[PDB]
Symmetry: D2
Subunit: 194 residues, 4 copies
């Protein structure tokens, strides 16, 4: 039902920022496994909720969140990366300046909170429709970003960088900005503002 | 659809251990509200799952756990209380001695962890089917007991005691043993060993 | 050593919004107990740290957070309540309009998140020094507000309202605005902007 | 103050189960960094607790637990691994049989819960002094094992296996039993029983 999306580029297209092997494992092993497990979990949850099997439905929650979140997060991440992703739209850049001062400031602040994640997780730039502002946040494990529309995510599970950067998470978080797909991020921003 | 179970006794039947005013509010307001909200949340979850709306389904998890757990926990709780509880079955008493040394020891150890809950929650005596042993545990808020079969629960949300005992939670926890429905607890134990 | 602050009013001075019986128990039993336990935990933590007993120091963390937070939160809370609160300072009102549109909007939004706390906890209006904006948040149990400067807090532990309002938490949260000490909240805001 | 312990073997001595590069980074980068950060955090905490700077002391908790736990966990882990670690002591084997049925059953059960960790963490065999039984548990991130004496730990942060096993955590968890230092584990068991 839920399916593994093809990448919008080939496995080596993000070198030298992220290696072919990192991408191939990340897509073919991690994302594929989140999808396969999600489909199994979702079927079980459908059954449990329909039947009012309440203990079971509650028991399935951590697995739905983890595999479902895995699918949500990685699907967004692939669209967020490009060999040549361009620059923010004028509208996005103007809003970055409003809410963070400059793109430089945003990159520093998001990189810092992302680097600081204890264990596995994600950093996010998002847009909050209620307060009409850009925000930055982190999520543990595969918890999906909630409370704001996701625009740009940075995966800091060790599987996202270890083969190439080894322990040096900061160099990966800083380098990923080189392959940020600003065309996609800008499109997500435009959609979030409607 | 889920329904509010009738109490197996009248609202004043557990005095002087738990007051009629505590019991009326506990069942007619709290449990009723958990049931009403549970039915609505379960409908929204079924809709999200049916649509394959993964973010929405994941977002409803805390509400299902809280109200579903509220329903599970209070349903067990009413069956666990009696003016004329009796004493543990021979097999439950034998197992209490095997796993805790004595009933006195069990009561002290469960009372202590229950009194120590920070904020709202529950203390439980349960039976672990895998290791075939009795265990004690606490749960936060309305999280249902998982990983073992619930036998006897003690609600330490302030609404369970504040009108009568005020801040003196230990007096309530120590006193609740006088109305532990050992007939029901023994039945739950027998079922857990099947 | 930490000390229980005197209330800046008598126990019945906030009637009919909060009862004298609620106030007496809240300050003389709860806050006093958080202070007494805090002093003992802080002594044990200092001993563990002095000895370099890392496991022991880490093990005391939840108790320090709970009782230390209890002390921090209630200390702020008493200063945040007044029979004659006044109104927001001109600069705080201007900032409320800037960040929430109106005081009415702020009150609704904070009341809503506060009423929604699952279990025990607090709702807060705070000021974020980094982004130089007002924010609203909730905290579980006695966790102190972090990441922003606390301006106004609403305690939704059941002990804060149950004797008077019973299960009807929304009536208490809506009513507390009538005794919000805007003189103190405005002073806290001015200090936060220094 | 706290210091990085030398390994009790050379970096390549656990091949082909764990590679030289994995060990070298794990010790020289991860453990060293936990130690360096711990020392800085512990100094700050000492100051904050002495002075009753309560907000600060509470703020430092997640960092003490993470880096302090990192030091605790890795220090135990190195002693738990050996090229030729021998077999359990007669006393440990007898207790394994009592509490788990067989060593085979223990290995399956601990491997399963360890494999199932969502995100980063550790699996543990420990000994509970109160109930006088072996138990198995998992811990998130670098949280140290609490409530029982640690005997054998299995690190399933991705940095512990990714360079060699890539995504295949189960093969690493299963293979690590080949290099379990049963001499050390047995000594820890003997000490825990006193
Ligand atoms: Mn990933
Ligand atoms: Mn209750
Ligand atoms: Mn309170
Ligand atoms: Mn490690």
């Amino acid at each position: 039902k839920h399916t593994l999306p093809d990448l919008p580029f080939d496995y080596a297209d993000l070198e030298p920022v992220i290696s072919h092997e990192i991408m191939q494992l990340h897509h073919q092993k991690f994302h594929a496994t989140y999808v396969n497990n999600l489909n199994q979990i979702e079927e079980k949850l459908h059954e449990a909720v329909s039947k009012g099997n309440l203990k079971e439905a509650i028991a399935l929650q951590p697995a739905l969140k983890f595999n479902g979140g895995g699918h949500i997060n990685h699907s967004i991440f692939w669209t967020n990366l490009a060999k040549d992703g361009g620059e923010p739209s004028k509208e996005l850049m103007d809003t970055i300046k409003r809410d963070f001062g400059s793109l430089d400031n945003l990159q520093k602040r998001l990189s810092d909170i992302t680097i600081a994640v204890q264990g596995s997780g994600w950093g996010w730039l998002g847009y909050c429709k209620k307060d009409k502002i850009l925000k930055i946040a982190t999520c543990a494990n595969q918890d999906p970003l909630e409370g704001m529309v996701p625009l740009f995510g940075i995966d800091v599970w060790e599987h996202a960088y270890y083969l190439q950067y080894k322990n040096v998470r900061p160099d990966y978080v800083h380098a990923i900005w080189k392959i940020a797909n600003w065309k996609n991020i800008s499109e997500r921003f435009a959609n979030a503002r409607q």
